[PDB]
Amino acid sequence: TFGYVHGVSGPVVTACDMAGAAMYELVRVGHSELVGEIIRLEGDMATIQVYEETSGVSVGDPVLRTGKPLSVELGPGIMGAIFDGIQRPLSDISSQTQSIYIPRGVNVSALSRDIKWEFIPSKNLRVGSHITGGDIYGIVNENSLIKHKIMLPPRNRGSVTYIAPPGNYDASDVVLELEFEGVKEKFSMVQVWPVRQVRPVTEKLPANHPLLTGQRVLDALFPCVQGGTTAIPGAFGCGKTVISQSLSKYSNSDVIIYVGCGERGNEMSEVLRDFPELTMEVDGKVESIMKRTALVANTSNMPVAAREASIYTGITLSEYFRDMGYHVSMMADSTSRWAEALREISGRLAEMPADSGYPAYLGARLASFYERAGRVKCLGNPEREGSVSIVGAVSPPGGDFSDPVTSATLGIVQVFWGLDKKLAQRKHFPSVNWLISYSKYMRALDEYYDKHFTEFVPLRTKAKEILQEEEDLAEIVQLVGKASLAETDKITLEVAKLIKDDFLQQNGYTPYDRFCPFYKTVGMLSNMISFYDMARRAVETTAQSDNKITWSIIREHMGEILYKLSSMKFKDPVKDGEAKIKADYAQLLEDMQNAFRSLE
Template sequence: MSQATESDAVREDGEIESVSGPVVTATDLDARMNDVVYVGEEGLMGEVIEIEGNLTTIQVYEETSNVAPGEPVENTGEPLSVDLGPGMLDSIYDGVQRPLTVLEDKMGAFLDRGVDAPGIDLEKTWEFTPEVEPGDHVEPGDILGIVPETESIDHKVMVPPGSDGGEVVNVKSGDHNVEETIVELDNGEEISMRQEWPVREARPAADKKTPRTPLVTGQRVQDGLFPLAKGGTAAIPGPFGSGKTVTQQQLAKWADADIVVYIGCGERGNEMTEVIDDFPELEDPVTGKPLMSRTCLIANTSNMPVAARESCVYTGITIAEFYRDMGYDVALMADSTSRWAEAMREISSRLEEMPGEEGYPAYLAARLSEFYERAGYFDNINDTEGSVTVVGAVSPPGGDFSEPVTQNTLRIVKTFWALDADLAERRHFPSINWNESYSLYKEQLDPWFEENVAEDWPEQRQWAVDVLDEEDELQEIVQLVGKDALPEDQQLTLEVARYIREAFLQQNALHDVDTNCPPEKSYLILGAIRTFNDEAFEALDAGVPVEEVTDIDAAPRLNRIATTPDDEADEFVADLEDDIKEQLRDLY
């Protein structure tokens, strides 16, 4: 948003009556719901959230200390919107799309109140290459031309959704800034590279389809056991220190999405600082270019104003939908939706609304649904296809998954990656609990895995799940009577499950090779473990003691497949399986 100026559609000014934290009440303000206003002498940005008679309630996106009754309130007459156009990638914004790097250049690390800057640079010129010519008829959403936004991404300049459309009468190629007219239509409409869109309103699409392609994350436990579809929704709940942020950052680095929108929503400042410092240094594994060249960061830390935290997820999802309209697959990471819900709770309590469970507003479930429902795999209005995949971290207090934010999220999302503090304490990362996690996308994604990885992918996955389930049941007996009291076949099952946990489910995010594992390699690892399982049980049936079966030299090499370079994995696994068979068959 830009500051209100003389030329803006400014309505009658009001006056502050009371101030309660981020909630300000004004009188005599001619406004509508969700209008953006500027509060006080300093012009702090806010949004109308309640109107009752002559009283207008505003949530202010900045710190309100020293704001006093009697100061003016100015209404812009427009809802909270974001600037959309080339220049959003490789940018770092706050919750209301103020570019933090631009503001830092102006005033240093500590920002003054009431400052503002456009979401995209209005002066910078971009090289526009048209894809239409005079005489062509264009409709809303149609692609007019291409701008090389970053080293990795071409920005597709589109007819705005609210346009009447018409016949192109003039096209201007070459270098232009985002406000200059690049296409003129016969009805007099002038189109530039810049669009605005209200953040609380979903951008239009022709159709929402059932997603049938996985978002390949490069993480074995997610791709292998609990896959997520492109255009799907996932939740990562976990207590403090269980690895939510690292898991999301791994997804941002390695998921096969074209664009990444990363929202740091109310997390600790030092965590967000790590993200801001690390991402510009990271190399995109696909293109070899900087990862930031296809990433947009929204940083709204826990010490920033609470109202801006409430709006940051809408800012992020609107930017994601804009790139979806160009035909890109976008992955949006929200870290964390619990902090967003806490911001809603604080504002709701200041409005003296009737609280729901644990003090959260009664509309908590509806707001979560509205957010996650904007994800999906879409036929766009310009005949392209694009997707927005939403992964939301949840931070339940004390790791209690029965609290309202986790439970309401579970009713909406179809993939659930439950992080476990006990696994994290045992240094098992990613600490996704395979007994509590699930994916409802398995069946619709299986045809893709069968065609692109292996025909028996679903069967291999189900075998691993069954072994882990059996291990979970046996662990209760082991805790009572010890492992040696079990029959030999059950002892062997525990050993096989251990290899599934250590060689397959565990993954080292800091290892050059193991940090990312393509599905083909995940399949190889599970196949090698299953070969050991089948050969070991045959040896056991032939009368070989379980201690000798599990003591063969080849078995520990199963743990080394993950760190073997991808192009050498086939040969390594083939040799290993031959050694396993030879050593076990020599025992009988």
């Protein structure tokens, strides 16, 4: 029951000579209290794996006997702060220590025990009523945007005995107490949940609502669904914040949880200002989004096991706030960093290198954390519902799409937004490829689109066909010289160009072009494709009938109409009314119809 530490082959040490206890328990070693995991047992012996450094630990130093596995504390106040893999409140640690370097073994809870909070119970249940796991039992007003509901943990039930009156209380004050068959249990504002399992839900409901993204590009093209899974490659100079910011501001999600690995303080500070700058006027005011969101990240110096546990801490936080009855979006950034973390862990266990150092169970772990997703029906009295989405950014080593990890992720995910650096070099933002990106969720979205628009699907299919045909014809027009071809083909190229310069592009530094409503995008695309349809029919008829109209004639006669099509993007729905924009677009369509009729 005492220290019998060893030396190390790396940054990890072992011990033995302790009582029997279940493995995968985190026990602390020494007076500096270094955290390590029970792994292997041989009789009274039990090896350990500390994550911090091993220097300075003698034989015989005390072994603090815990009773739990790797776990994360859950409760109010998580939002607004920053946490590492072990869930340590780094900002509060800096405040308490008034020091720069991380002290070893900081024995402070993720949440303090010195801040009061306003509590309101269900105000309908009484003493003696029956309760079961998942049933809400309170509500906390963390801030003016989100209210954090409170329920009983799973695997709990029985007859209530004590309901606290409302008031100002901290987390150390027991708020609920009940009597089960033969025993009685007490519950405070905080609950602890094992990391290595899945929280239970009544069932899963198929995802059928499109995730809202501010940019019309990568939303009208290759839509995402709330509760889905997707992959976006990311590298230096191509931009990852261009999507992180977009999902942090221009989206229907209720919460963002950004999990990082191997990051710098630039993203932390820039995002902590981006929250009070790029803000949502839901109630007509500017407010920090940090109060809504939660940030977790580690750097390269941190312990490898902490780097590996960071993603699990993130996703369990996501599921806790998804049980709340909300929409959660998890940015699981740098799957490559996660993969090297796994390789580093496996390096010390002497596991067979299957494929470039990867353990055999890499694909299993991949599938198992992507498994924890989707829209679900939560456990509770009032039939709570909500969704959690994951966005796993891929990071190929030099753009080689042959990693085991990248290939497996491609196999699991359903949507893919290929990102390029060539377009950013070409001065085109946002950077999408339009050919290697794909979406597989269209079949589910057919119901919603048929219920609301009844034109998006034909129009999108037409746009995709036109773009692919133009890419096919780019080579023939290169061998002809781009100065002679059939009029129908020419007009096809012209509309493909049009779609390129006024539909498939958006400026983030223009105040009014940082958010395109989906209906606005649909109206734009319908207008453009109707214009093309009428032009194509006119040319095809006049080719055989009389006075074959050439695109020169069309463009010169209708140059004002091309000007209006180019200027359609300058509408600014923020200041300009929806009905006004619809009336303007319909009037433009009527003008185009009359102009075409006067032509023929």
